[PDB]
Amino acid sequence: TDKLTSLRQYTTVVADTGDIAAMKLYQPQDATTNPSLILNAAQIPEYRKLIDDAVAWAKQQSNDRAQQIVDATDKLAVNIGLEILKLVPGRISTAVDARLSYDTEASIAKAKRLIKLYNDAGISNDRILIKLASTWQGIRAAEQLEKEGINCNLTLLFSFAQARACAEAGVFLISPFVGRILDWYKANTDKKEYAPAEDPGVVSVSEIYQYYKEHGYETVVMGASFRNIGEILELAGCDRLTIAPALLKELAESEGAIERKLSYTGEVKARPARITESEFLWQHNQDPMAVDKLAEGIRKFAIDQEKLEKMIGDLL
Amino acid sequence: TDKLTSLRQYTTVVADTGDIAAMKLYQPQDATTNPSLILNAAQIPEYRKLIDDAVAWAKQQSNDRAQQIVDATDKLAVNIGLEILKLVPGRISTAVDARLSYDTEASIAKAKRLIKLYNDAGISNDRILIKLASTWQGIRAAEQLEKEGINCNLTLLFSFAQARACAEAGVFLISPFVGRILDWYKANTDKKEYAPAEDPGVVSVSEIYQYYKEHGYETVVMGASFRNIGEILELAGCDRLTIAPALLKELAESEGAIERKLSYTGEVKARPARITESEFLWQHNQDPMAVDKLAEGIRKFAIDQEKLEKMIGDLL
Numbered sequence: 001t002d003k004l005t006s007l008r009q010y011t012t013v014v015a016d017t018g019d020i021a022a023m024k025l026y027q028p029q030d031a032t033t034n035p036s037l038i039l040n041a042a043q044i045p046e047y048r049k050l051i052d053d054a055v056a057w058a059k060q061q062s063n064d065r066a067q068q069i070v071d072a073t074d075k076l077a078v079n080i081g082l083e084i085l086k087l088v089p090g091r092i093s094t095a096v097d098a099r100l101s102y103d104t105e106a107s108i109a110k111a112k113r114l115i116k117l118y119n120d121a122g123i124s125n126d127r128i129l130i131k132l133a134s135t136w137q138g139i140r141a142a143e144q145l146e147k148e149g150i151n152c153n154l155t156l157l158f159s160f161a162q163a164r165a166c167a168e169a170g171v172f173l174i175s176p177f178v179g180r181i182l183d184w185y186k187a188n189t190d191k192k193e194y195a196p197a198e199d200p201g202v203v204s205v206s207e208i209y210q211y212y213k214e215h216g217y218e219t220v221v222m223g224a225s226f227r228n229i230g231e232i233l234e235l236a237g238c239d240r241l242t243i244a245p246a247l248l249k250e251l252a253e254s255e256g257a258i259e260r261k262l263s264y265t266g267e268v269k270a271r272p273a274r275i276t277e278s279e280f281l282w283q284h285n286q287d288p289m290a291v292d293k294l295a296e297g298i299r300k301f302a303i304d305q306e307k308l309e310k311m312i313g314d315l316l
Numbered sequence: 317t318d319k320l321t322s323l324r325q326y327t328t329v330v331a332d333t334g335d336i337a338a339m340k341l342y343q344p345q346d347a348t349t350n351p352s353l354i355l356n357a358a359q360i361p362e363y364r365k366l367i368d369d370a371v372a373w374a375k376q377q378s379n380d381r382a383q384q385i386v387d388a389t390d391k392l393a394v395n396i397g398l399e400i401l402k403l404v405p406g407r408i409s410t411a412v413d414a415r416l417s418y419d420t421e422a423s424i425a426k427a428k429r430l431i432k433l434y435n436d437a438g439i440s441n442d443r444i445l446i447k448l449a450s451t452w453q454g455i456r457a458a459e460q461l462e463k464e465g466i467n468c469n470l471t472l473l474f475s476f477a478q479a480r481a482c483a484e485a486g487v488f489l490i491s492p493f494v495g496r497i498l499d500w501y502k503a504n505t506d507k508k509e510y511a512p513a514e515d516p517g518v519v520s521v522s523e524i525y526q527y528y529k530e531h532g533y534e535t536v537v538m539g540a541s542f543r544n545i546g547e548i549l550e551l552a553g554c555d556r557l558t559i560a561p562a563l564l565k566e567l568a569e570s571e572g573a574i575e576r577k578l579s580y581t582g583e584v585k586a587r588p589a590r591i592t593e594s595e596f597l598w599q600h601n602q603d604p605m606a607v608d609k610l611a612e613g614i615r616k617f618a619i620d621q622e623k624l625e626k627m628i629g630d631l632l
Contacts, residue, residue: 102597137594278453281418285611292608295601 003229003258004251007236010260014090014222014242018080019044022245023087026252030090032153032175032224032242034131035098035301038077039308050079055315065316072312073305078117085127093153094118095131098301107132107141115150129153129173133298134162136280143169155224156297159290161275161283163208167217168274175242176205178235179225180297184289196230200289205235206262213264215271229254237262319545319574320567323552326576330406330538330558334396335360338561339403342568346406348469348491348540348558350447351414351617354393355624366395371631381632388628389621394433401443409469410434411447414617423448423457431466445469445489449614450478452596459485471540472613475606477591477599479524483533484590491558492521494551495541496613500605512546516605521551522578529580531587545570553578 004026007013015028018041023031033041041047054075058068081092096110111130118128130145131153132138139162142152151172157163158177166174178201185200186192196202205223212221222240226232229250232241237260243251275283285291320342323329331344334357339347349357357363370391374384397408410430416422427446434444446461447469448454455478458468467488473479474493482490494517501516502508512518521539528537538556542548545566548557553576559567591599601607 099598102601103594106594135597137597278419278422281451281453282415285418286615288608288612291611292604295607296604299602 001255001257002252003233003254003256004248006257007232007241007251010237011235012240013248014240015088015248016224016242016244017041018084019245020083020087022248023084026245026248028088028090028248030092030129030240030242031084031088032093032131033077033080033084034093034095034155035304035308038080038095039304039311041080042076042308042311047080050083051076051312051315054079055312059316068316069309069313072316073309074114074117076308076312078114078121081118081128082121082123085123091127091129091151093129093131095155095301097305098133098298099305101133101135101298101302102137104137104141104144107138108144111141111145111150111152112148125149125151131155131175133294133301134158134166134174135294135298136165136277139165139169139171142166142171146170146172153222156294157208158204158293159284159287160204160207160211161280161287162290162294163211164275165280167212167215167219168271171219173220173222173240174208175222175224176208177225177293178202178205178223178231179227180293181289182227182231184293188289196234199231199234201225202231202234205238209238209262210264214266214269216268217271233258234261236260317571317573318568319549319570319572320564322573323548323557323567326553327551328556329564330556331404331564332540332558332560333357334400335561336399336403338564339400342561342564344404344406344564346408346445346556346558347400347404348409348447349393349396349400350409350411350471351620351624354396354411355620355627357396358392358624358627363396366399367392367628367631370395371628375632384632385625385629388632389625390430390433392624392628394430394437397434397444398437398439401439407443407445407467409445409447411471411617413621414449414614415621417449417451417614417618418453420453420457420460423454424460427457427461427466427468428464441465441467447471447491449610449617450474450482450490451610451614452481452593455481455485455487458482458487462486462488469538472610473524474520474609475600475603476520476523476527477596477603478606478610479527480591481596483528483531483535484587487535489536489538489556490524491538491540492524493541493609494518494521494539494547495543496609497605498543498547500609504605512550515547515550517541518547518550521554525554525578526580530582530585532584533587549574550577552576 013028014030018033018037054072058071100106134154134157154166155175181201220239224242329344330346331338334349334353370388374387412426450470450473470482471491497517536555539554540558
């Protein structure tokens, strides 16, 4: 059999894209999107109807241009999610405006607004994951949202401090990155080549996985961001993995069964006291890579959000 | 005349070192130290008496080894400051443990402890500046300390967001860095050489200076960290400048008068609303250089603090 089929025995496959074409080809359980993937998806010719639809809807909700752009942009993200939900049995992850990453109250309000739009379309909360950056503020926002019946996907997770804080907040799922960690080491270290087993990103997720299972945390661990299939295979056994269409294709075209790599067979251990904000900040900032990448990831998502608003603005 | 003498017409000269030998040679108004300079100073043979003195005092305050190391380390920093105060008419800057940089409450307590040690030696608060890293937590700590009669030196200032937040908190003085900003650009940019006027560090302090004087803020602007005298001359006119002995020597050996570069001759303008924590975090993290350097500066100061404790530990 092929690698993709074999991987499904140990790990739930998730497609990292806003393109419905990939959903039909690989039949993933869930799908994930982010501001950058939404921008790209908005370029797809067949998605034109989704855009006009968002704009029309927005103009019917208010006559304030400022508010129309915001409504149109949020509605487009939701419209794309709706198309995807017609092709997958699981969940769709939709991100809150990255510009609100350091504002807990604003993030909670935005998340509720997105949930409202999905509900207005008849979609219940159990088919959605609101995605937020894993800053201290985003984690605090998620803790509150989960208590209110809104499940979250905590992304841009780079340091162990972020992983620990997310588990203690009881979030539904986390998206620890692999590829971007490798990018940092290739650019800031002498070593430019890594064997799958020594890939910094792979080591990071493996340690997070162990810590989570070892303490009985129910938060789903979903590795994200990949540069090659080697990273993916080295993480076989991870709860879920969200993979780009290009790598999904490679797995499906490579023959050979694979073996499970990530497992925890011991007994659950007692959990420690919760980490405080001060300890979180100290530990997160002890990691040069995590410091750079979290801030950078937020900056790029914000830029793409703005580009989308620009595009929508010219259609009003 | 020489450059040093000429500079004193426009700017208050401060010596950046814990070595009293420099105080006698350049007769600065104030002196600044930090964890790294204290560690270096502890290596100076004539400073042996200051160390034995700190250790002896510590052992007389308690019989708890853990507490003795902390007391000995703090007392050594104060003993060095005391020696310096005998040679300068102004103030001495002494830093709080960098490991507490993200903990407001702990930083306030540590600062009060250092003030207590200086007071026990008969030194009043007007001859001291407690130095803290310019994280949001350090700025909030400083705002409280100033209200209690304790003047602070906010250091490791890299972004405009930090500069603005410090002014709004009413801190006594800020130490915006110049040299380390240049280091970042030389390592992360194509351009490796900069004319004094285009030096990123010089531009940063100039903009901060303008913003402060333009709005009537009383916080003293003291440029710190230099790589060459070109950066220093380009900032002639800055309230104060703290310079390493090596550069002080170069200025004193170069003949020729210099001209004032930094000035604000307009009228004071109204101040805007205060920046919030969310806005501060968004703006600070928009600056790739500031993100890297603030976190890095704190890490290095913490490492040197630990090395000092190690050294003191072997003497108990």
